[PDB]
Design a protein around this ligand. Structure first.
Ligand SMILES: O=[N+]([O-])c1ccc2nn[nH]c2c1
Length: 265
């Protein structure tokens, strides 16, 4: 209730459309602002993509140490890791790490190819119970973020529930689960979004995303000391303020989420 008004005030000053979901795993209870509205995912999809790959590894259809070869012509804009390994190539695990930790666009496209494309990612999501999130396009076309376009979107609540089952539930094997946590925890943003609003003593594994039509997102599983973990998803789009302002918007969601856990009662 109170956090809602605070977020709606924050949404006004952003000029855009803000969506937040908070899933407390101690109770399975969730708080949500536009939690059942569609928002463009941009790079936050890469957390799901590495999950779907690890699920192939669990099934035996993939190996984290499989070498993937690619040439200069497979590269798209923003490939900080993969661009320096056109010769060697990279293992699946190295592409997953590059995609989560640095948002390497070629890594994600290479992992989508190994998977079977946006439809295979969407198909995996369905198999774990997410009936909402959808990936339709490849990098970088999927960062369009056009209002009313349902392609490449999720909801704050759907994304939060999906992170819960992948990182904390029984969707992946325990080892794949631990591996996906390890990748998300070693973000190198790093960091100015949710991370910036939170207590430093927290262990945070997060994924950021940026797009057109004034879009910045951040999703995260947070482990507070001596406390069950909490899943926070934040989606901002149609924002009229600039990229640095959008970062501070997301950090302010983080601060408000903490205040409401400690004080609203
Ligand atoms: O992100 N959080 O929802 C959250 C809530 C309460 C907390 N106490 N410590 N860290 C926290 C994070």
């Amino acid at each position: 209730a109170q956090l809602s008004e605070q977020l709606a005030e924050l949404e006004k000053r952003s000029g855009g459309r803000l969506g937040v979901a908070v899933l407390d795993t101690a109770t399975g209870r969730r708080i949500a602002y536009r939690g059942d509205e569609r928002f463009p995912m941009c790079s936050t999809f890469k957390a799901l993509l590495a999950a779907a790959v690890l699920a192939r590894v669990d099934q035996g259809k993939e190996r984290l140490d499989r070498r993937i070869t690619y040439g200069k012509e497979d590269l798209v804009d923003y490939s900080p890791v993969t661009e320096k390994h056109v010769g060697d190539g990279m293992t699946v695990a190295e592409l997953c790490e590059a995609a989560i930790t640095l948002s390497d666009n070629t890594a994600a496209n290479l992992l989508l190819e190994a998977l079977g494309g946006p439809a295979a990612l969407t198909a995996f999501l369905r198999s774990i119970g997410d009936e909402v999130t959808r990936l339709d396009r490849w990098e970088p076309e999927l960062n369009e973020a056009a209002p009313g376009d349902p392609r490449d979107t999720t909801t704050p609540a759907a994304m939060a529930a999906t992170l819960r089952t992948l990182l904390l539930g029984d969707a992946l094997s325990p080892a794949s689960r631990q591996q996906l946590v390890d990748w998300l925890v070693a973000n190198k943003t790093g960091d100015k979004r949710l991370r910036a609003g939170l207590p430093a003593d927290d262990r945070v594994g997060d994924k950021t995303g940026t797009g057109g039509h004034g879009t910045t997102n951040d999703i995260a599983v947070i482990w507070p000391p001596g406390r069950a973990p909490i899943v926070v998803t934040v989606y901002l789009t149609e924002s009229q303020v600039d990229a640095d302002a959008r970062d501070a918007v997301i950090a302010e969601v983080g601060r408000l989420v903490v205040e409401a856990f400690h004080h609203h009662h």
